[PDB]
Design a protein around this nucleic acid. Structure first.
Ligand SMILES: [Mg+2]
Ligand SMILES: [Zn+2]
Ligand SMILES: [Zn+2]
Ligand SMILES: [Zn+2]
Ligand SMILES: [Zn+2]
Ligand SMILES: [Zn+2]
Ligand SMILES: [Zn+2]
Lengths: 127, 65, 100, 114, 142, 88, 48, 56, 138, 44, 351, 137
DNA sequence: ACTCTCGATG
RNA sequence: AUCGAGAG
């Protein structure tokens, strides 16, 4: 779930294709971006698993896409999980083009401020 | 459990802001309000998202299996 | 209430109300929670192991008989005197897979 | 469990056409058009742009049920004016305004810092 | 567009109770019956039916829907066919079917026999009464 | 002086695990020394299963007073620990 | 009457006195599982 | 089912999601809110009995 | 309720022995007509005799319980207008903790025995983790 | 098949007619290992 | 459904209640019950010629059942019968019987007052059986002395499951008394000619309910019938062999006990006759007593098919006479529709 | 949202609002008789066992259990046990099916001996329940 | 003296 | 079967 919510690079998303449109089996490089995640507890301290640990695997063939957004100051990004001493997390993510109408994870924006007539001169609101 | 990746209400990413929040709390010895304000959490929904959260995974990691 | 029952009441029950005509009963000793396996081995039972294996977290009663003996097993209230979790630290509980 | 698929909000079903034009039997020279896989985002805009055309007598959209992504738009125009042309003019006007808005926002963005 | 009345708006601690629909939802169109009463079993997990209670019956009476009341109490639940002696009016009939041998030891009846449709629970009631030295004799004429 | 208030909480007692286990154990143990009296008069072989199975039964079924349905404590003296919420 | 309160004893004293049941009562046709003389069943339908 | 209005014949409109959706103005004779309330639904098995439901 | 506890139950015999050795007449040596205003003393619903000058006895017992010599669980009831004294050591009694108000304050009025110093010691024990609830009770 | 212990990190492969207990441990609590046939998750 | 029968389909118009005459009981029965052993006999999955005969109804999902066959789904219950060593009391009639003995003196068998009496003319004038009996019982239980046969009628009181006399009544005695009341006296106190007689209230031989009444997954009724049979054979054993005085009477009262508690278990007598599991056991009387009883729980209201239940919610866009039905429920519940030329296409599509 | 009903933001729901985990344990045990008659844990085939379940057993392993990770649904068989009561059809079925109305993923499987030395098993199945129309708040 | 839903133990 | 908890 929280992997799904991770903000990925969607700049050249328009020259990517919907998996439902592509004539491939399941998914391919023309519709989806595959990135792996391999983390393991090493030190005695808690080993954090961020979004930077995600590694693009599929062939991007030039398109700026898939790279997890990191606006974090330290450069880590979204905190995905926390591992102990001998805890391992190994998985593979297949990212596809989607509309935020289908799931809020594909939401390109957050909060949009919107206000008209700050004096109630139209009288659309009875205070 | 663990800090929610994005805010429920709007959708702002607040998963990368947990550790920084803790640092602003203990390292700079600030109060919660100012710490939340510095992290760009102006709306009280996200402000809530971080302030209200309880990191339970730290207690879950106390087990060996 | 339970601790009062173990440390005081039990001895009263055994001593004050029982004598046959002879075999007089003496002091009552309450052990720590153990289990007599089908393997024959009797060993210390911890609450997590008791709940996982559908076992009964109980200790054994022992009475001195005159003219020693095992008379049965009493279920032990958790975090009581005759429980391992009473003198246990937080780290101990975390090692015993018991929530602090 | 009984919840419908998400893509059924924008992906057309089997045989379902995007627009269904129906001759309104109430008042003469009127029409009711069924928009499939669309919501208020399109309905409100088109309806509001139909009221700008002064040769349009009636224009109103409605979503009969929030469960389903579809809405009905009723249009009534003056005699000698086919309502489809009113819809087309409205649409083209919308597209033009949006294009101009895009160009304007771009030119305004090219003048900013930070 | 703006709303006329302004809205009371703010954070409030809500809790999610454990009564969820998919754990509650239930539907049955002819399922497993009980053995003693031959009626639909009790329970959602056992894929059972819902009790058409006494009050429901009273409502159907108040409406006047007699045929519906009969349907719920026969075709929907337990519907059974029994044979009745034309003499004593009891379920003594040894109805050897496929040979048309409708015997009745105790009245010597082989030609004056009847066939009725009753709920299996009614059959159970009548039998239990018969085992309790009581004869609920059933005649089919006024 | 008016009638005694029979709903006065001061003249009421709560019996917890202590007194309950006390009554139960008194019964089972008296039963034990009874059976041991029988084994003695028949003539070290002491059936410890009495106390164990008795306590376990009463704690499991919630029916205080061993296997006798005449018990008015059938209202579930011991119940399953509700663990849906910590507060619960 | 047996379909309310005192059930068994009613059946007993009815079995002793050998009572005749008219079977035009509602609960009686309910027991027998027949269409009771209620509203819809308060008459007969034939063909002419 | 206190009175006869506790059992009424409705027309079926098959819908998504796992709830019995009813009209607001029918809340009163059933005496029901939606704070977890459950309702039952029976189905006729012949023409005459569904005629009974629809006409009575 | 959050602070309610149930009485474990203790032995009433030392309390009896204390009563008899503190100016209490045996019930078998009671003559009502020559001492009508004598407070009768009850222990667990048992009349062990009467006692004159009940105030001193009551303050004594109270002081003992507040010190700890008598189990704090034990309840002591002084009924003035009925001239009775009921001491309960019964198990199953639901009790609750209360602040003690005594007018021993010289430079003032009726004040709480507990002071901000005690509270400071409590919070000191809290921050350090030697002064707990038992220290307040004793 | 194979099973892993509960209160220690091991990897027993004792099939049927073996069962309890563990290898160099002493406790009888045995968990079963994860399947090799991976399962997909719709990240939603 | 089931199958085709040559018999015409009719409707129950009348229900004539009555008592079960031992004659008709043993005439109706198709199997005598000699052995208390249920099914298994010396490690054999069969049925001994005692209790639960295959004649009463087979119980193994077979295709045979007392030659009548028709499996076990069509064939109802075929009643049996068991003869008691001595006649016993029917519990539910204990009162009524005790009343009759007060309306008629001992040995003889005649009403205490006739048309010669003034008030008895008024008491016998009532046509209503219950009211007539109630009117006579109150004006006949005060008579001590007595047609002739002048004998001081004893004061009868109830004690457990027997009756006493003050100047202990035997069940055989009361049988012999009720056997001599004749027909004309029956009409005077409610009873009927061929349907219900006081000489049938007392249990000579009792009918045995078939396996479809007491199934096995053994039933409590089977255990109680085993108890009755055991007491009976024990009684016969203590009768045909060495028969002590103060030993067989206890066995008679034992058979009386088990038979009386076989039907009614919630009596004034504290012995509730528990079972092996400590259960108070389920009597026939308890099977019928509401609200979980047979009448109120299976007849007045019973579980039905083609039904559903769900959490409700409001919907402003539904018409008043509409109901939102979840898709799953819509697929579950079904309606039988006969193929007609009007709808054969639509039905073909649905199939 | 009339008559004590409420409207919930679906977007926030998609972001994990009020989601929950739901764990359920199914417990089974091998029986024992006086003459050493023991039920066994295995994956029985259609021909070797009576009755059987209408669900499939293809998710079971050699030991008659499910490997934790496999998604279960409908009336799948979680535990395979047989009780033996030459002759064809030599066993009775005693398998434990997944809850008819439930579904999800096998979280974790526990295999342990009893106090009397009886091999018994606790299987925990896990499902994520997401706030749907009809859920009580 | 209303319908449901589970859980326990024989 | 009974018992216990919960839903309107
Ligand atoms: Mg409500
Ligand atoms: Zn592709
Ligand atoms: Zn927000
Ligand atoms: Zn006949
Ligand atoms: Zn190990
Ligand atoms: Zn037959
Ligand atoms: Zn006479």
């Amino acid at each position: 779930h929280r992997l799904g919510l991770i903000p990925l690079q969607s700049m050249d998303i328009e020259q990517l294709e919907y998996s439902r449109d592509c004539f491939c089996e399941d998914h391919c490089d023309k519709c989806s971006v595959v990135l792996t995640l391999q983390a393991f507890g090493e030190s005695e301290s808690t080993t954090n698993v961020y979004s930077k640990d995600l590694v693009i695997v599929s062939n991007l063939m030039g398109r700026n896409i898939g790279h997890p957004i990191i606006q974090d100051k330290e450069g880590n990004g979204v905190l995905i999980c926390k591992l102990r001493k001998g805890q391992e997390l190994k998985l593979t993510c297949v990212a596809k083009k989607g509309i935020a109408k289908e799931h809020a994870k594909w939401g390109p924006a957050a909060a949009i401020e919107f206000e008209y007539d700050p004096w109630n001169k139209l009288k659309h609101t009875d205070y | 459990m663990i800090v929610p990746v994005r805010c429920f209400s709007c959708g702002k990413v607040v998963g990368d802001k947990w550790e920084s929040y803790l640092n602003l709390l203990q390292e700079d010895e600030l109060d919660e309000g100012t710490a939340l304000s510095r992290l760009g959490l102006k709306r009280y929904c996200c402000r809530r998202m971080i302030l209200t959260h309880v990191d339970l995974i730290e207690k879950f990691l106390r087990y060996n299996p | 209430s339970f601790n009062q029952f173990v440390d005081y009441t039990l001895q009263d029950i055994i001593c004050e109300d029982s004598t046959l005509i002879e075999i007089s009963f003496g002091k009552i000793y309450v052990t720590k929670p153990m289990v007599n396996e089908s393997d024959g081995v009797t060993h210390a039972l911890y609450p997590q192991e008791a709940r996982l294996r559908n076992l009964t977290y109980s200790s054994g009663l022992f009475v001195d008989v005159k003219k020693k003996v095992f008379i049965g097993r009493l279920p032990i209230m958790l975090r009581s005197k005759n429980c391992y979790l009473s003198e246990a630290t937080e780290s101990d509980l975390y090692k015993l897979k018991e929530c602090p | 469990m009984n919840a419908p698929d998400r893509f059924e909000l924008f992906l057309l079903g089997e045989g379902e056409s995007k627009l269904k034009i129906d001759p309104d039997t109430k008042a003469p020279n009127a029409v009711v058009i069924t928009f499939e896989k669309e919501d208020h985002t399109l309905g409100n805009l088109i309806r509001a742009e139909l009221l700008n055309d002064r040769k349009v007598l009636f224009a109103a959209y409605k979503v009969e049920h929030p469960f389903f992504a579809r809405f009905k738009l009723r249009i009534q125009t003056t005699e000698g004016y086919d309502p489809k042309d009113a819809l087309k003019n409205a649409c083209n006007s919308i597209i033009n305004k949006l294009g101009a808005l895009k160009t304007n926002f771009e030119t305004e963005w090219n003048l900013q810092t930070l | 567009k703006k709303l006329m009345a302004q809205i009371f708006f703010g954070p409030t601690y809500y809790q999610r109770l454990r009564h969820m629909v998919d754990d509650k939802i239930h539907a049955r169109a002819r399922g497993p019956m009980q053995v003693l009463t031959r009626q639909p079993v009790e329970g959602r997990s056992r894929d059972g039916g819902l009790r058409f209670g006494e009050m429901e019956r009273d409502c159907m009476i108040a409406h006047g829907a007699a045929s519906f009341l009969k349907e719920r109490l026969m075709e929907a639940s337990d519907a059974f066919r029994v044979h009745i002696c034309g003499i004593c009016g009891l379920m003594t009939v040894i109805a050897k079917l496929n040979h048309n041998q409708f015997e009745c030891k105790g009245c010597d009846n082989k030609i004056d026999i009847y066939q009725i449709h009753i709920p299996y629970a009614a059959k159970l009631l009548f039998q239990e009464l018969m085992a309790m030295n009581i004869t609920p004799r059933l005649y089919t004429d006024r | 002086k008016d009638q005694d208030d029979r709903d006065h909480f001061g003249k009421k007692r709560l019996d917890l695990a202590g007194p309950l286990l006390a009554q139960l154990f008194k019964t089972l143990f008296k039963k034990l020394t009874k059976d041991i009296f029988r084994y003695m008069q028949r003539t070290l072989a002491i059936n410890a299963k009495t106390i164990t199975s008795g306590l376990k039964y009463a704690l499991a079924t919630g029916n205080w007073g061993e296997q006798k349905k005449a018990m008015s404590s059938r209202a579930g003296v011991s119940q399953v620990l509700n663990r849906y919420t910590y507060s619960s | 009457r047996c379909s309310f309160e005192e059930t068994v004893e009613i059946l007993f004293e009815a079995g002793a006195s050998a009572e005749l049941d008219d079977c035009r009562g509602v609960s009686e046709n309910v027991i027998l599982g027949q269409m009771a003389p209620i509203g819809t069943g308060a008459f007969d339908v034939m063909i002419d | 089912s206190l009175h006869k209005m506790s059992m009424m014949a409705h027309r079926v409109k098959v819908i998504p999601y796992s709830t019995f959706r009813l009209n607001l103005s029918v809340t009163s004779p059933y005496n029901a809110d939606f704070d977890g309330d459950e309702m039952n639904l029976h189905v006729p098995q012949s023409e005459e009995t569904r005629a009974e439901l629809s006409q009575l | 309720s959050l602070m309610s506890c149930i009485s474990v139950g203790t032995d009433p015999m030392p309390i009896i022995t204390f009563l008899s050795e503190w100016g209490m007449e045996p019930l078998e040596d009671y003559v009502p007509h020559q001492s009508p205003d004598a407070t009768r003393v009850f222990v667990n619903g048992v009349w062990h005799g009467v006692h004159r000058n009940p105030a001193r006895l009551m303050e004594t017992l109270r002081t003992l319980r507040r010190k700890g010599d008598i189990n704090p669980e034990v309840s002591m009831i002084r009924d003035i207008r009925e001239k009775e004294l009921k001491i309960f050591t019964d198990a199953g009694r639901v009790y609750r903790p209360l602040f003690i108000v005594e007018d021993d304050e010289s430079l003032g009025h009726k004040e709480l025995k507990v002071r901000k110093g005690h509270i400071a010691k409590l919070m000191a024990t809290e921050y350090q983790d030697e002064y707990t609830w038992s220290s307040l009770l004793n | 098949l194979k099973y892993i212990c509960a209160e220690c990190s091991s990897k027993l492969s004792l099939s049927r007619t073996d069962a309890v207990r563990c290898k160099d441990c002493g406790h009888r609590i045995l968990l079963k290992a994860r399947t090799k046939r991976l399962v997909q998750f719709e990240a939603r | 459904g089931q199958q085709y029968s040559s018999a015409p389909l009719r409707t129950v118009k009348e229900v004539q209640f009555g008592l079960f005459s031992p004659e008709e009981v043993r005439a109706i029965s198709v199997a005598k019950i000699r052995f208390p052993e249920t099914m298994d006999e010396t490690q054999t999955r069969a049925k001994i010629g005692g209790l639960n005969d295959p004649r009463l109804g087979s119980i193994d999902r077979n295709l045979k059942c007392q030659t009548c066959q028709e499996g076990m789904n069509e064939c109802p219950g075929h009643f049996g019968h068991i003869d008691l060593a001595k006649p016993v009391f029917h519990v539910g009639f204990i009162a009524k019987i005790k009343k009759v003995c007060e309306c008629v003196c001992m040995h003889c068998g005649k009403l205490l007052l006739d048309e010669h009496n003034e008030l008895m003319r008024q008491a016998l004038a009532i046509k209503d059986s219950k009211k007539r009996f109630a009117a006579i019982w109150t004006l006949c239980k005060t008579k001590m002395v007595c047609g002739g046969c002048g004998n001081t009628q004893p004061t009868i009181r109830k004690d457990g499951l027997k009756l006493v006399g003050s100047w202990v009544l035997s069940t055989e005695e009361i049988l012999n008394i009720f056997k001599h009341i004749s027909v004309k006296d029956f009409t005077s106190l409610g009873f009927n000619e061929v349907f219900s007689r006081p000489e049938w209230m007392i249990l000579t031989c009792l009918p045995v309910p078939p396996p479809p009444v007491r199934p096995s997954i053994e039933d409590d009724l089977t255990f109680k019938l085993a108890d009755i049979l055991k007491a009976n054979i024990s009684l016969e054993t203590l009768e045909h062999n060495g028969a002590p005085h103060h030993a067989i009477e206890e066995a008679e009262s034992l058979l009386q006990f088990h038979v009386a508690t076989y039907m009614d278990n919630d009596i004034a007598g504290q012995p509730q006759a528990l079972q092996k599991s400590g259960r108070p056991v389920k009597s026939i009387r308890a099977r019928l007593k509401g609200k979980e009883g047979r009448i109120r729980g299976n007849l007045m209201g019973k579980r039905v098919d083609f039904s559903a239940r769900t959490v409700i919610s409001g919907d402003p866009n539904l018409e008043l006479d509409q109901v939102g039905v979840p898709k799953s429920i819509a697929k579950t519940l079904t309606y039988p529709e006969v193929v007609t030329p009007y709808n054969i296409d639509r039905l073909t599509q649905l199939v | 949202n009339q008559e004590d009903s409420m409207i919930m933001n679906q977007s926030s729901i998609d972001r994990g609002l009020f989601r929950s985990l739901f764990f359920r344990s199914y417990m089974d045990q091998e029986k024992k008789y006086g003459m050493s008659i023991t039920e066994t844990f295995e994956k029985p085939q259609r021909t070797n066992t009576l009755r059987m379940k209408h669900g499939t057993y293809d998710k079971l392993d050699d030991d008659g259990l499910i490997a934790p990770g496999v998604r279960v649904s409908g009336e799948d068989v979680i535990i395979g046990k047989t009780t033996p009561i030459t002759a064809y059809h030599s066993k009775r079925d005693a398998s434990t099916p997944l809850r008819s109305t439930e579904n999800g993923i096998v979280d974790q499987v526990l295999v342990t001996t009893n106090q009397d030395g009886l091999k018994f098993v606790k299987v925990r199945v896990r499902t994520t329940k997401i706030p749907q129309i009809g859920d009580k708040f």
